[PDB]
Amino acid sequence: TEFRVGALQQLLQIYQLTSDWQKAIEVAERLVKLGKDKQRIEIAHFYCELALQQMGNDDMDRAMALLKKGAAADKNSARVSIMMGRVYMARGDYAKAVESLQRVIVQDKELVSETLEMLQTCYQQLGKNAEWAEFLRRAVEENTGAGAELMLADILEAREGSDAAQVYITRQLQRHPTMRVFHKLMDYHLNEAGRAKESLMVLRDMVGEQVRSKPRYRCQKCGFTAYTLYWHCPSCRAWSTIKPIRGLDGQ
Amino acid sequence: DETEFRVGALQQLLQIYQLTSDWQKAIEVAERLVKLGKDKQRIEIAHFYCELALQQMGNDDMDRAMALLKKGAAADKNSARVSIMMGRVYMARGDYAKAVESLQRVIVQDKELVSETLEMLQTCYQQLGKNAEWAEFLRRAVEENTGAGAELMLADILEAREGSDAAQVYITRQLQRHPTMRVFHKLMDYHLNEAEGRAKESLMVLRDMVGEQVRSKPRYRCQKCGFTAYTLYWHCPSCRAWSTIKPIRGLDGQ
Ligand SMILES: [Zn+2]
Ligand SMILES: [Zn+2]
């Protein structure tokens, strides 16, 4: 309908700036039927933002209703799976929280790293700590990143000591080299007491400065970078474009 | 119009000829588009010549290749690839004086490719006995942030005069001013050199792991499509662009 699509697109952008998510859905729904299948992705995020402000009213069940509408809009949205997970955890339904959250593996494998702080407090309190270490082991070799590698490395330093963990990360750091796991060299720093002990911790600190100063996430549209995760990019105003930085300088 | 139709047909011939490595036929079509007003083709014309000069360099015909390179220089005054290939031609003919001249034109044509000229220039300056001027060129190159290759080159030269310690404090300075895994790797070698006692074994295994990443990581990336490569490809196998592959800058690279 020519100029009418332009007016909707503007209205759609302005309604997100004014954090008017319900109005943003109305405009986005019209664009979906006008041929803009890409706004399907953004409608699910709008239900996620609506649900977020329903959680601030404690109406956790109305929030869960918004998330199911969001899942209806985007089956592949990993954000709805994470938020439905937080709900099932709030209710103590730790089994259903693992059934979602693990949906992220099929939805966006670059975001499985985000479901690991939860799913840990889910396997714990479900009584399945051994099944958890198997999940991490199957996640590290599936290449989830330095996050899963170090969560697994912690479990072993407590089950089998500081010596069997040093030999573990050495093998994994070959298979998947990353500067963060190399920093875990403290394992060598637990020994060695001469002139080189005073030569090795200076090398570690150099690595340590880079581990904390280097950003953790980058937008795939523009170059935006941050230490935490954003669903909406504060530079190009896109959705689902910020993923963890994969590489030596990252995870 | 009738001219816009003919332009579109030349572009189709130029595409088919690039794709078949028919550089001679590609130059003919490209020269026609230049006549019509598409001057940006002169960039593709110089690469077409450099592909031909690469054919003649494979038959030890340095005079035929240098003739083609002069034609490429005439099409593209700014092609840094021409300057480098004329360095290889002068150097095989023993003309090390002229080799420095064309290789150094890269500083103007494409500052991101100067690191690709350092090893031949180091060879040109030792053959002329101008090893002291090479050091001055390198200090200027390190300060203009040419890369870890220049930083490491200057660090061997700084050892050939004042040894360790003196070269180390320079590297630790450059490492802080410009962190790279590669320079970090060299800093590790300075810390075990003249420093055995079961901690060297701890450091030596860490230095190997770093060096294992230095020898095996790709150093080049296409700026247009992000394709990475171990060699400097002038024609990007992925997106087929010309002179988009540059050395990877950063921690992962120079
Ligand atoms: Zn962005
Ligand atoms: Zn490319």
DSSP secondary structure of B5-60: HHHHHHHHHHHHHHHTT-HHHHHHHHHHHHHHT-GGGHHHHHHHHHHHHHHHHTTT
Tokens representing A107 are 């939805």
Neighbours of B87 (CB within 10 A): 27
Half-sphere exposure of B193 (CA within 13 A, CB side): 12
Neighbours of B7 (CB within 10 A): 15
Half-sphere exposure of A132 (CA within 13 A, CB side): 23
Ligand lying nearest the CA atom of residue B222: 2
Task: Let me know: does B167 contact B190? Beta carbons within 8 Å.
Answer: yes
For residue A239, report the distance from its CA to the centre of ligand 1, in Å. Answer: 8
Task: Let me know: does A173 contact A181? Beta carbons within 8 Å.
Answer: yes
Rounded Cα gap, residues A89 and A82, in angstroms: 11
Rounded Cα gap, residues B210 and B75, in angstroms: 44
Radius of gyration of the CA atoms of chain B, in A: 22
Long-range contacts of A193-198 (CB under 8 A, 24+ apart): A193/B199, A194/B197, A194/B199, A195/B195, A195/B197, A196/B191, A196/B192, A196/B195, A196/B197, A196/B199, A196/B200, A196/B202, A196/B203, A197/B199
Q: Which helix (H) or strand (E) holds A217?
A: strand A217-219
Which of A173, A182, A196 comes nearest B200 by C-beta? A196
Ligand lying nearest the CA atom of residue A240: 1
Query: Do the Cβ atoms of B203 and A206 come within 8 Å?
Result: no
For residue A21, report the distance from its CA to the centre of ligand 1, in Å. Answer: 20
Task: Let me know: does B106 contact B116? Beta carbons within 8 Å.
Answer: yes
Distances (CA, A) of B161 to A46, A209, B109, B133, B165: 66, 32, 33, 14, 11
Could you tell me which CATH number the domain at A1-75 has? Answer: 1.25.40
Strand arrangement of the beta sheet that strand B220-222 belongs to: B228-229, B220-222, B245-247
Residue B95: burial class (beta carbons within 10 Å; 0-12, 13-18, 19+): middle
The angle formed by the CA atoms of residues B36, B40 and B43, to the nearest 5 degrees, is 125
For residue B249, report the distance from its CA to the centre of ligand 2, in Å. Answer: 17
Task: Let me know: does B117 contact B106? Beta carbons within 8 Å.
Answer: yes
Task: Let me know: does B187 contact B168? Beta carbons within 8 Å.
Answer: yes
CA dihedral sign of residues B177, B180, B186, B192: positive
Rounded Cα gap, residues B80 and B111, in angstroms: 9
Rounded Cα gap, residues A221 and B236, in angstroms: 22
Residues 6+ apart with CB under 8 A from B201: none
Query: Could you give the residue ranges of the DSSP H alpha helices within A2-59?
Result: 3-17, 21-33, 39-55
Residue of chain B whose alpha carbon sits nearest to that of A172: B209
Rounded Cα gap, residues A169 and B23, in angstroms: 51
Residues 6+ apart with CB under 8 A from B227: B221, B236, B237, B238, B239, B245
Rounded Cα gap, residues A61 and A49, in angstroms: 15
Task: Let me know: does A110 contact A135? Beta carbons within 8 Å.
Answer: no
Greatest pairwise CA separation for chain A in angstroms: 78
Rounded Cα gap, residues B51 and B63, in angstroms: 15
Domain range list for chain B? 145-213, 217-254
Tokens representing B115 are 């690191």
Q: Which helix (H) or strand (E) holds B215?
A: helix B200-216
Q: Amino acid identity, residue A38?
A: K
Residues of A in contact with B195 (CB under 8 A): 195-196, 199
Residues of B in contact with A206 (CB under 8 A): 175, 179, 184
Interface test with B, best of A192, A207, A211 (most B CBs within 10 A): A192
Place of tokens 């990007």: B236
Rounded Cα gap, residues B87 and B84, in angstroms: 5
Tell me the three state secondary structure of residue A103: coil
Task: Let me know: does A50 contact A77? Beta carbons within 8 Å.
Answer: no
Residues of B in contact with A182 (CB under 8 A): 206, 209-210
Distance from CA of B108 to the nearest CA of A (A): 28
Query: Do the Cβ atoms of B181 and A210 come within 8 Å?
Result: no
Q: Which helix (H) or strand (E) holds A171?
A: helix A161-175
Report the interhelical angle of B62-75 vs B80-92 (nearest 10°): 160
Q: Bridge-partner residues for A219, per DSSP?
A: A242
Rounded Cα gap, residues B26 and B49, in angstroms: 10
Tokens representing B207 are 């230095």
Tokens representing A144 are 């989830």
Q: Which DSSP string corresponds to B120-156?
A: HHHHHHHHTT-HHHHHHHHHHHHHTT--HHHHHHHHH
Residues of A in CB contact (< 8 Å) with B are 173-174, 177, 179, 182, 185, 188, 191-197, 199-200, 203, 206, 210, 214, 247-249
CA dihedral sign of residues B162, B167, B168, B173: positive
Query: Could you give the residue ranges of the DSSP H alpha helices within A37-143?
Result: 39-55, 60-73, 78-90, 94-99, 104-107, 120-123, 129-141
Task: Let me know: does B179 contact A203? Beta carbons within 8 Å.
Answer: no
Rounded Cα gap, residues A112 and A105, in angstroms: 6
Strands A242-244 and B228-229, sheet pairing: unpaired
Neighbours of A207 (CB within 10 A): 17
Residue B239 DSSP label: T
Residues 6+ apart with CB under 8 A from B18: B26, B44, B240
Neighbours of A127 (CB within 10 A): 9
Helix, strand, coil fractions of chain B, as percent rounded to 5: 70, 5, 25
Residues of B in contact with A188 (CB under 8 A): 202, 205-206
Half-sphere exposure of B91 (CA within 13 A, CB side): 22
Residue A10: burial class (beta carbons within 10 Å; 0-12, 13-18, 19+): exposed
Half-sphere exposure of A184 (CA within 13 A, CB side): 23
Task: Let me know: does B176 contact B141? Beta carbons within 8 Å.
Answer: no
Residue A19: burial class (beta carbons within 10 Å; 0-12, 13-18, 19+): exposed
Which of A192, A195, A214 comes nearest B202 by C-beta? A192
Residues of B in contact with A203 (CB under 8 A): 187-188, 191, 203, 206
Known binder of ligand: residue A219?
A: yes
Tell me the three state secondary structure of residue A219: strand
Tokens representing A126 are 């479900």
Tell me the three state secondary structure of residue A236: coil
Residues 6+ apart with CB under 8 A from A102: A115, A119
Rounded Cα gap, residues B41 and B189, in angstroms: 48
Tell me the three state secondary structure of residue A51: helix
For residue B102, report the distance from its CA to the centre of ligand 2, in Å. Answer: 27
Rounded Cα gap, residues B158 and A16, in angstroms: 58
Tokens representing A195 are 């002139």
Structure determined via: X-ray
The angle formed by the CA atoms of residues B124, B127 and B133, to the nearest 5 degrees, is 65
Task: Let me know: does B231 contact B221? Beta carbons within 8 Å.
Answer: no
User: What separation, in Å, do the N-terminal and C-terminal C-alpha atoms of chain B show?
Assistant: 50
Ligand lying nearest the CA atom of residue B243: 2
Query: Do the Cβ atoms of B202 and A182 come within 8 Å?
Result: no
Rounded Cα gap, residues A134 and A8, in angstroms: 49
Distances (CA, A) of A63 to A46, A47, A96: 12, 9, 16
Task: Let me know: does A28 contact A16? Beta carbons within 8 Å.
Answer: no
Tokens representing B142 are 């390190």
Task: Let me know: does B72 contact B46? Beta carbons within 8 Å.
Answer: yes
Residue of chain B whose alpha carbon sits nearest to that of A197: B199
